[PDB]
Amino acid sequence: SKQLTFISAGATAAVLQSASAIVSKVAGGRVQTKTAKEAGRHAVVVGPETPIGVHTAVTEVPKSAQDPLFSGVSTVVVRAVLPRAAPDSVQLRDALDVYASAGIDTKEEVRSATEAFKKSAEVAVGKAKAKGVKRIVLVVKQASKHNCINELFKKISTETIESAGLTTEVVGTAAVANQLIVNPESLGVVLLNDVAATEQIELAFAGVVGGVSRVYHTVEGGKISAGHSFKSVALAVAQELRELGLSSEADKVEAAASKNPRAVVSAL
């Protein structure tokens, strides 16, 4: 009757097959599992690549699935995601910086980027206020090529955050990545500008913590789970089932993911 929407973005067929087997075996057939390329609710996205229709890329450190190495850490990494066009078309994150060099007008693109950054900054400040932190850390790649997208990102994120009353500390990519992997307890909320390096950093943090599920906030309004490995996808499916209103099944999936990461389907 119900429906879970599976989005595939750069994920090997093995991961998708494992996710399908897990949902079929756990749910028992009560909720169907359809595949698509875009969704707004009740959606699990598999693979490193960013799907179409997501504007924020928040990720946290769930208490249950904390690795013993990272026990007690609490830092929220929110990646700002600009609207995604078709693979052939030029993405906004690159158009906004190349058209300016070429002299082409960049008004509509700037407007769209401003809207996306405002939404991401609102999400980040909400998370920071909920956690109680006073300052957030902006992450911008300091390459000369990205001298316009990051400038707008700072100009808008700092504006919105200061309007909300919190402080912002800008930093590069290498230093923040090393600090997040080595000493993450010194960062409460870290926003990431939309670049490939920031996506890799978010994935690295989501994996090093022990494997977690990344939450995507879409344009339509809602939360869709995201995973890239067996354990991450299992946790994402568990969270999705919990959202649908299944507690025991979600707990079983979470326990199976904790015990046997790569073979959860057989474990449970």
User: What is the spatial distance between Cα 259 and Cα 169, in angstroms, rounded to a whole number?
Assistant: 39
According to DSSP, the residues that pair with 46 across neighbouring strands are: 8, 227
222 binds other proteins (CB under 8 A): no
When binding is defined by CB under 8 A, the residue of 1, 144, 247, 248 that contacts other proteins is 144
64 binds other proteins (CB under 8 A): no
Q: How many CB atoms lie within 10 A of CB 219?
A: 14
| Nearest Cα residue to 43 out of 197, 246, 175, 217 | 217
When binding is defined by CB under 8 A, the residue of 32, 163, 183, 266 that contacts other proteins is 183
Q: Which of residues 102-141 bind other proteins (CB under 8 A)?
A: 102-105
Q: What is the CA radius of gyration of the chain?
A: 19
CA 239 to chain centroid: 14
**Considering the complex, what minimum distance in angstroms separates the CB of residue 173 from other proteins?**
5
Of 130 and 196, which has the nearer Cβ to other proteins? 196
When binding is defined by CB under 8 A, the residue of 34, 37, 111, 145 that contacts other proteins is 145
User: What is the spatial distance between Cα 51 and Cα 225, in angstroms, rounded to a whole number?
Assistant: 11
Go through 60-75 and write b for each residue having 16 or more CB atoms within 10 A of its CB, e for each that does not.
Answer: bbeeebbeeebeeeeb
14 binds other proteins (CB under 8 A): no
155 binds other proteins (CB under 8 A): no
Interface region with other proteins, contact rule CB under 8 A, candidates 16-24, 52-60, 88-96, 115-123: 88-96
Interface region with other proteins, contact rule CB under 8 A, candidates 51-59, 162-170, 198-206, 243-251: 198-206
**Considering the complex, what minimum distance in angstroms separates the CB of residue 209 from other proteins?**
8
Q: How many CB atoms lie within 10 A of CB 204?
A: 13
User: What is the spatial distance between Cα 57 and Cα 199, in angstroms, rounded to a whole number?
Assistant: 9
Interface region with other proteins, contact rule CB under 8 A, candidates 22-30, 129-137, 226-234, 245-253: 226-234
115: three-class secondary structure by DSSP: helix
Where along the sequence are the contacts to other proteins (CB under 8 A)?
Answer: 48, 67, 69, 88-90, 99, 102-105, 142-145, 172-175, 177-179, 181-183, 186, 197, 200-201, 203-204, 206-208, 210-211, 228-232, 261-262
